[PDB]
Write a protein that binds this ligand. Structure first.
Ligand SMILES: [Mg+2]
Ligand SMILES: [Mg+2]
Ligand SMILES: [Mg+2]
Ligand SMILES: [Zn+2]
Lengths: 33, 209, 83, 67, 129, 100, 220, 72, 113
RNA sequence: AGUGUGGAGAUCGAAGAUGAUUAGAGACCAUUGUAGUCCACACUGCAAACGAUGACACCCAUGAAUUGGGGAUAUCUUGCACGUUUUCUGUUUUCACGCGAAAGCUUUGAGGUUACAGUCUCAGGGGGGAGUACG
């Protein structure tokens, strides 16, 4: 009720998804190196 | 006003004129004070009311009569009053001077095809607040306004203001007596030395019931 | 007064009025501007044929300062006494 | 599409409208198909009753001025 | 803090003229401000003015006659050669028939018409019309 | 679009940083003290009918000694104030009217 | 025929007022469109339609459509007027805008760029007019320049009698309702700018309604 | 309150413009080399090639057609 | 037996203006007068008009009724300072300090109150 | 909010457990409960960290109210409080001129700008990809 039309999905949850992705990539690179 | 191109004292306030003003307490107002009328205030009396400077009140009145004079066809001046205490004080005034009177319908001065469409040349009102519609309409058609204003009167679209109490029945009918008398004296129907024959009881208003 | 061609004639039509208080031009669409005539009075207290005319621009009236402007104009003109 | 043009008075509803209104209709043959035209006219009154009705309108009252 | 005394004074005069005032008080004053006002006075755009002494930077009371439309300063004070007068006239003046650009030159503070007649350049201070 | 000049609270720009929150009377939601709707309530302990029966049986409570009352200060969240009819939405032009 | 209602309309019917400049002098409103065509010859007042477009209003089960028209009048000699009206059909809107344009006539001041030879050909000073986001700025130009403007403002300037001018538009000029009014406002501003040529005072005049007040009473 | 104005402030104004020109998408494309490498043409107006096969590409909605193309 | 329509109310007012001296508080005599002075098609409408006319007559007996203006009895009802000079104005002190500041000084017959 | 090392552990309570709702209910509701919530020392440097409004300086319409200090001249207790009028600083409320696409702003600017220049400084240049990839 307090916000316009976001697009996609609640931006905070989108950011949380990107955060988890970056953590997984960091782990894979660490294993390879 | 009182000052004349030729040095004279005829248009000056005498003792008799002043006496009536204190008789009906036309010099007193209400407790609130507008910022546009500070120049007409003298001081605060008991209970918080304000005193109006009688000298400037006289000068405004005589200036108003001088403007009313030199206007041909007195019907060009309309006198309006939305207050109920001046409903007859305007008629007795108009019955003696010959001006138009009425005591409002939006569009009277603006709706050309209206049946009651009139365009007076000078408007006279009794209270700028209660006659806001009248004076607001006059602003679109280049009509000057002369008003009887108190200590808390908004002076918008008002050109000549007479500082006086327009709340009491006595004061409202008392003021129109001077205005009626002065124009007749200026016109020449009567002479200054003789007392004015008309008395204020006809101007004084009473309960219709 | 006005614009001259340097050929000798005026090319400026309708030199407009100027407000007495502020000395500003009054435009053709200024429907709040007014003109007031004040009667002259002879020594006996009877009016005279001549009259005094002044003009006030619409902006002053809407602001609510026309009454103050009129007072100072008449004091300077000597129409009324200051004291 | 349908278009309408009007001017003046026009009474509907009730029964008196059949007496005070004159109506007609026709079909007109363009190259594309049929066209309908209707015309209705509100007749003014008349004392004779030839160019209009005799009776006044059902809801009009007139007060005769005293001598 | 206040950086330009001349710009402060000219802004004060322009506002009072726009509001229809008859007198305006200017504070603080300086030699440059007084010379600018005298150029305006010579061309009839203001009336008389009075300088008051207070053992500090003084004050000025100016009488207005309603003929001023706008006055303002130019900052920074760009250099103007004798061939740049036309460019400045077309950029900040309402027309070529009235209005002045005020300069400071080796011969003193003057308007652009006087400066051109004497064949001198300088730095632009302000304008009025 | 800013709906209210005061933003629905009583905290102008250069006045305060933070105001301590309080619990709503009904639901318990935490809300700043200057934003909550506040009322003072002085209600009779007994209804008019039941008071008469108790007063009749009481040697103490007659006509020259009234019965005690309850005094409470109530603060509600916005949602609980609206549903409980304490405060209702007003037209755009009437939102400025403030009583005391 | 024409039966005047206002006092000004009766005066021009009686030929007591003959020039449009007297009306402009006292800043009086024109409420009958027959006044301006009486005081201007029928062979010199040119009118033209500028734009017509539909506006709509949503409604349960459909929508409602109307038309708006813009008209401009002038004699190409320092007089210009613009009017706009809305009607249920294009014919009705066009007729009503012609009346409104005549009632909005204002005078235009003209001057010289540099040397003063012959008739005035350009505006006397820079002016800008604003309506909505659209602003139009007019700059005096030399004798051979012509009208340098977009097709919509150029047409209006031709009807006013300006030969040479430089123009510049500011923002969202495709909104032609605002563009037309912005050009009109800039021209109307030419007679309000005090110049050194208008410094001296003039003798006061008397209102036409005051001069013929006695006759005005007789007519009614 | 958006730009510096001093008489001896040319260095600040020069640096400010240089950094803000990069925000222009058109200006940046013409002053970098990434676009030229991406362009199958090496910056030329035309190129020659060999046809590999003929394909059909469906038109995007709301149109409906099979647009005839080749791969080169 | 419900609200009176504006066509009935406007007609009843017109009748009272022109025929006031012929009417009274009786429905049955008033109806006879109306059937002579009005031309109308509906008998039912004439009954409603005679009903509301009788209502207006009763109200006019008590006092004036807005929207009538009989204009024959109003005129008759319309046609139907020395007291305070003796008493004395007795203005307050703040006014007293201002009366003598004038060029005419303190006016005669004044007090302090 | 989170992390480390020592304390503390009443209340509330991420994770988890058990009842109910429900087609499903891992949720909203009920009873609980670990980390936490609190303290000391050491990290982290993010918020609708908002007046979504950078800092300093000038001019500006009216009436209120209110906090602190000062100047001048009725009420009450027995030095205090209060009354009237001025003043400096702060902090607010009644479409000022004017501005703006509007909503709205208005001595407290979002005013004094195409009639465009008081001083310094930070950021932006259609929507995404993306605050992502590499360093
Ligand atoms: Mg905060
Ligand atoms: Mg549940
Ligand atoms: Mg628990
Ligand atoms: Zn709640």
């Amino acid at each position: 009720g307090t916000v316009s039309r976001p697009r996609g999905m609640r931006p905070k949850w989108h950011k949380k998804r990107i955060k988890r992705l970056k953590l997984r990539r960091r782990r894979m690179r660490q294993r390879s190196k | 006003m009182s000052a004349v191109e030729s040095g004279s004292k005829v248009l000056r306030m005498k003792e008799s004129d002043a006496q009536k003003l204190l008789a009906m307490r036309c010099h007193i107002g209400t407790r609130n004070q507008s910022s546009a009328m500070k120049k007409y205030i003298y001081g605060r009396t008991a209970e918080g009311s304000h005193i109006i400077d009688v000298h400037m009140m006289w000068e405004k009145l005589i200036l108003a009569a001088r403007v009313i004079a030199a206007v041909e066809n007195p019907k060009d001046v309309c006198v309006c009053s939305s207050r109920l205490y001046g409903t007859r004080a305007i008629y007795k005034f108009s019955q003696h001077v010959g001006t138009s009177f009425h005591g409002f319908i939006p569009g009277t001065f603006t709706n050309q095809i209206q049946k009651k469409f009139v365009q007076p040349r000078v408007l006279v009102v009794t209270d700028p607040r209660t006659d806001h519609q009248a004076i607001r309409e006059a602003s679109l058609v280049n009509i000057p306004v002369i008003a009887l204003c108190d200590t808390d009167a908004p002076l918008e679209y008002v050109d000549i203001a007479i500082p006086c109490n327009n709340r009491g029945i006595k004061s409202i009918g008392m003021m129109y007596w001077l205005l009626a008398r002065e124009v007749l004296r200026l016109r020449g129907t009567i002479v200054r030395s003789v007392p004015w024959e008309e008395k204020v009881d006809l101007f004084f208003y009473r309960d219709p019931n | 007064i006005g614009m001259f061609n340097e050929e000798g004639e005026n090319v400026d039509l309708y030199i407009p009025r100027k407000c007495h208080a502020t000395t500003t031009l009054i435009e053709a669409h200024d429907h709040a501007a007014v003109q007031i005539s004040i009667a002259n009075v002879g020594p006996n207290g009877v009016i005279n044929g001549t009259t005094t005319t002044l003009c006030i621009a619409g902006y002053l009236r809407s602001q609510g300062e026309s009454d103050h402007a009129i007072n100072h104009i008449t004091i300077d003109r000597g129409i009324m006494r200051i004291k | 599409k349908s278009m309408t043009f009007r001017d003046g008075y026009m009474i509907k509803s009730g029964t008196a409208h059949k007496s005070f209104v004159d109506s007609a209709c026709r079909h007109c043959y363009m190259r594309a198909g049929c066209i309908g035209v209707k015309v209705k006219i509100m007749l003014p009154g008349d004392s004779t009753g030839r160019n209009g009705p005799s009776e006044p309108l059902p809801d009009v009252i007139t007060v005769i001025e005293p001598k | 803090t206040m950086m330009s005394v001349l710009a402060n004074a000219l802004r004060t005069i322009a506002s009072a003229e726009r509001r229809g005032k008859r007198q305006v008080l200017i504070r603080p004053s300086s030699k440059v401000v007084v010379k600018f006002l005298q150029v305006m006075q010579k061309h009839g755009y203001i009336g008389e003015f009075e300088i008051i002494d207070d053992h500090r930077a003084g004050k000025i009371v100016v009488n207005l006659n309603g003929r001023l439309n706008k006055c303002g300063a130019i900052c920074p004070r760009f250099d103007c050669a004798t061939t740049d007068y036309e460019k400045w006239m077309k950029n900040i003046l309402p027309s070529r028939q009235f209005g002045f650009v005020v300069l400071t030159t080796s011969l003193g503070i003057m308007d652009h018409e006087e400066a051109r007649s004497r064949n001198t350049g300088g730095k632009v201070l302000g304008f009025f019309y | 679009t800013t709906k209210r000049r005061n933003h629905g609270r009583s905290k102008p720009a250069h006045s305060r940083g933070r105001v301590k929150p309080i619990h709503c009377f009904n639901c318990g939601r935490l809300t700043p003290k200057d934003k909550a709707v506040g009322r003072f309530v002085v209600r009779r302990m007994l209804d008019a009918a039941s008071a008469r029966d108790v007063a009749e049986a009481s040697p103490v409570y007659g006509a020259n000694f009234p019965m005690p009352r309850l005094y409470m200060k109530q603060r509600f969240c916005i949602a609980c104030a609206i549903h409980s009819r304490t405060v209702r939405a007003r037209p755009v032009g009437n939102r400025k009217i403030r009583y005391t | 025929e024409w039966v005047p209602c206002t006092k000004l309309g009766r005066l021009v019917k009686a030929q007591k007022v003959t020039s449009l400049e007297e009306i402009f002098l006292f800043s009086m409103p024109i409420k009958e469109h027959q006044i301006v065509d009486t005081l201007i010859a029928e062979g010199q007042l040119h009118d033209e339609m500028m734009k017509i477009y539909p506006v709509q209003k949503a409604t349960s089960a459909g929508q409602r459509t109307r038309f708006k028209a813009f008209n401009v009048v002038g004699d190409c000699d320092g007089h210009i007027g613009i009017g706009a009206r809305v009607g249920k059909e294009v014919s009705l809107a066009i007729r009503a805008s012609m009346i409104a344009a005549k009632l909005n006539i204002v005078p235009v001041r003209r001057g010289y760029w540099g040397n003063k030879i012959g008739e005035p050909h350009t505006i006397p000073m820079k002016v800008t007019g604003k309506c909505g986001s659209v602003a139009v700025r007019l700059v005096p130009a030399p004798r051979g320049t012509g009208i340098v403007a977009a097709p919509v403002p150029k047409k209006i300037l031709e009807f006013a009698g300006v030969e040479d001018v430089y123009t510049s538009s500011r923002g969202k000029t495709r909104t032609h309702g605002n563009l037309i009014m912005a050009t009109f406002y800039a021209l109307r501003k030419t007679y309000g700018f005090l110049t050194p040529d208008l410094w001296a005072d003039t003798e006061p005049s008397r209102d036409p309604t005051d001069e013929h007040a006695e006759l005005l009473a007789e007519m009614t | 309150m958006t730009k510096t104005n001093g008489q001896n402030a040319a260095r600040k104004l020069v640096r400010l413009r240089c950094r803000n020109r990069w925000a222009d998408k058109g200006w940046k494309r013409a002053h970098t080399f990434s676009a030229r490498k991406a362009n199958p043409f090496g910056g030329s107006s035309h190129a020659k090639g060999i046809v590999l096969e003929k394909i059909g590409v469906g038109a995007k909605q709301p149109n409906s057609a099979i647009r005839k193309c080749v791969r080169v | 037996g419900k609200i009176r329509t504006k066509t009935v109310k406007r007609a009843s007012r017109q009748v009272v203006e022109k025929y006031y001296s012929k009417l009274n508080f009786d429905f049955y005599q008033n109806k006879r007068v109306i059937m002579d002075v009005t031309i109308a098609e509906s008998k039912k409408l004439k009954n409603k008009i005679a009903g509301y006319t009788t209502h207006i007559m009763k109200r006019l007996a008590r006092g004036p009724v807005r929207g009538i203006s009989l204009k024959l009895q109003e005129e008759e009802r319309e046609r139907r300072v020395d007291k305070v000079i003796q008493s004395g104005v007795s203005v307050d002190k703040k006014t007293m300090q201002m009366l003598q500041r004038l060029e005419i000084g303190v006016p005669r017959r004044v007090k302090r109150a």
